[PDB]
Every structure is written in structure tokens, then in C-alpha cells.
Amino acid sequence: PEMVRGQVFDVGPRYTNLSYIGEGAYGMVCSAYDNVNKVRVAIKKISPFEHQTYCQRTLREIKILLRFRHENIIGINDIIRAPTIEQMKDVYIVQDLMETDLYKLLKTQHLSNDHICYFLYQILRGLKYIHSANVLHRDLKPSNLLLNTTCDLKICDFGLARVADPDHDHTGFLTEYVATRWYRAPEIMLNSKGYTKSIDIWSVGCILAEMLSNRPIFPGKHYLDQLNHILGILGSPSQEDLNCIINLKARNYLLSLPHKNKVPWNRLFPNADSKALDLLDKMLTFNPHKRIEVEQALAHPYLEQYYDPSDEPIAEAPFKFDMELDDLPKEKLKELIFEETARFQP
């Protein structure tokens, strides 16, 4: 069994010449030569069977990625595991090798308007498919957008994804949330569980703003500071938008703040294309009900050079988890992971 930095990275004989390419979702990732397709691939090692949350997120990612088939969503090419549940300790997931991601690209590279437009198009094209399957990604951010050397873009990491559930979206004020803080929509801090499609659109808006300046637009340092950042740019919500927030603790918090005026997008992004800023405004709308939807965003003039709804496929059917994964014991989850990965065995 081959080793990488003192770890068991046991993928062969199909996959040889391991080069370490960093750490990610649940640990070690290497590129490797696939001796069957004759290309380098990425392989991630998952060791999740101790912990219920690890198993839940692993199972959720596998079920979704195996069901999805889209050019802008990372596929699973292969899964390596032991032949029996008793011997299964790790799972290796083999995916197309993507040389970089938008987090790394933004730390080092200025994007042309043409690149920003193309990246945004591919993000929305992928998101149209995800939403058409009644799935919410819920953790869109630059590091979950993979890019290859020709700038093909693929969304990854469906570990926090959920089936959409708008009739159960309501919650109290300051309800804790799992997804990455800088890309959280304002309503998460106020009255939302992140069970509607508008949650992902806000993330995309944040990603667009970050592509325009190479800096995150709302870099909050902790839970409520994230809302301070958002309101610092959008300004105080309107009476109508406050009236949509029925929860008193949430409403009254917002009423307690001094008045803040909107920062014009063209002052934050003086070099941006005006059509990009019109689309940004519509994605970063405070009221989730007024927020642009993915299909409308694709049809926006900013994306006219690429928009073609006949080449923007949807899922053949809505997604549904068989059981509520959030209260299954880890032995049933190991067993479900074994079953879900069975198709890749001899």
C-alpha cells in the first residue's frame, strides 16, 4: 500500500505516481496517474466512520454527485474501498483533476471582465441544474469552484446540501448556522434556516463581487458582524422589507440600528462593467423574495454572449433523500455508504 507524507493512501494499482496536492473536505488529496483512462486524476481520502456528522456529509455528497450529471458540476469517476463493510475504513473518491480553484485564483490573479463573465455564466449554469433537482448547495464560495487550465468551472462540495423546503424555512433570530460565514445571506442571521434557493443566489452575488475586486465583499469576523458588513453596503432595509420580517427580536434588532445609506456599487467597483453591477444588485437584494432567481440571472444582459436555455440543462427528476439522514446511527450510515459505492466494485 502506497504512502504519502507518512499516511496510508491506498488507491493502486490503477492509480500510481501519487503527488500530494493538499488537504480539503475530510483530509488528504493527491493527484495520481489513472492507468486505465491515461490521464492524471484527483483522489481524495475520506475517513468518516467514527463520527455521525462525517458520515452524514460523506453520504450526502456521494448520493448527490452520483445522481448529478452536468458539465459545471464535479463528477465522481471512481470510488475505492474495501470489499466488505468489516474491512472498509477509508473511502477514496476519484474525480477529474482540476488544477486550481477560484479561491487560489483570486488570491493571485486579476480577472478580465471576459473571465468574470464566463466564470459567472458557468456558476449559474451549474446552479440551474442543482436547483432544477430541488437541491440547495448551501456552501457556495470561491474554494468550492474548481477550474482547470482552460478555465472550465465545476462546482464541488455538496456536504452541506439539502433538498429545498421553503414551507419550513422560518426560524428565530440569531439561529446558529453551518455554512461559510462571508457568503451567508442576511436572512440566515434574522429568520431563515437556508432552506430556499435564494440562499445560493446570495452566495453567487458575493462571489461575483469578489471576482470584481479580488477581496470578499462582506468579511465578517463572527456571526452578527456578518450582518453589520451587509448593512454597511446595502444600507438600512426599507419599511416594506422590514415588514416581511414578522419575528419581533429580528425586526427590533434592525429597528435599533442607526440609519445607513446604500454604498453605490459603481463606487465600490469603479472598474466594473455596468451590466455586471446591475446583475450584482439583483443577486444581493436584502429581501430574499425580491432576489433574482437562477434562470432570471442567466437571462440578464450581462450574460447575453453565453445565454442559451436549450444548452442549460435541467435534472431529469427532483432529488429526495430516502430517509432523514440527520437521525441515522453511524453503523447504518457506514452501511449506506458501502451500498452507495457498490457500483464501482469488480
Annotated binding site for ATP: 21-29, 44
Cβ-contact 292, 128 below 8 angstroms: no
Report if residue 258 touches ligand OZU, rule: CB under 6 A.
Answer: no
* Catalytic pick among 34, 139, 157, 200: 139
Residue 299 CB, nearest approach to ligand OZU (Å): 28
Residue 196 CB, nearest approach to ligand N83 (Å): 28
Sign of CA dihedral 185, 218, 224, 325: positive
- Alpha helices by DSSP H, listed for 166-302, are 198-213, 223-234, 239-243, 248-255, 265-268, 274-283, 294-298
Residue (157 or 210) nearer to ligand OZU, CB = 157
Cβ-contact 126, 311 below 8 angstroms: no
Residue (26 or 202) nearer to ligand OZU, CB = 26
* Interaction residues for ligand N83, span 23-42 (CB under 6 A): 24, 29, 42
* Separation of alpha carbons 155 and 173, rounded Å: 30
* Interaction residues for ligand OZU, span 129-148 (CB under 6 A): 143-144
Residue 203 CB, nearest approach to ligand N83 (Å): 19
* Interaction residues for ligand OZU, span 44-103 (CB under 6 A): 101
Over its C-alpha atoms, the chain yields an Rg (Å, rounded) of 21
Q: State the binding partner of 188 from ligand OZU, ligand N83, none, CB within 5 to 8 A by kind.
A: none
Chosen residue from 10, 14, 24, 175 binding ligand OZU by CB under 6 A: 24
* Separation of alpha carbons 202 and 171, rounded Å: 19
Residue (90 or 101) nearer to ligand OZU, CB = 101
CA nearest neighbour of 170 among 188, 186, 145: 188
Chosen residue from 146, 155, 179, 280 binding ligand N83 by CB under 6 A: 146
Cβ-contact 269, 213 below 8 angstroms: yes
Chain centroid to Cα 150, Å, comes to 21
Site string for ligand OZU, 291-320 (x = CB under 6 A): ------------------------------
Cell of 197: 434557493
Report if residue 94 touches ligand N83, rule: CB under 6 A.
Answer: no
Cβ-contact 78, 97 below 8 angstroms: no
Residue positions forming the annotated binding site: 21-29, 44
Report if residue 95 touches ligand N83, rule: CB under 6 A.
Answer: yes
CA-to-CA separations, 248 to 51, 73, 166, 167, 253, in angstroms, rounded: 37, 40, 21, 20, 8
* Interaction residues for ligand OZU, span 157-186 (CB under 6 A): 157
Q: State the binding partner of 97 from ligand N83, ligand OZU, none, CB within 5 to 8 A by kind.
A: ligand N83
Residue 322 falls in the annotated catalytic set? no
The half-sphere exposure of 11 on its side-chain side, counting CA atoms within 13 A, is 30
Kindly list the residues in this chain that would bind ligand OZU in the complex (CB under 6 A). Answer: 22, 24, 101, 143-144, 156-157
Catalytic residues: 139
Kindly list the residues in this chain that would bind ligand N83 in the complex (CB under 6 A). Answer: 21-22, 24, 29, 42, 44, 95, 97-98, 146
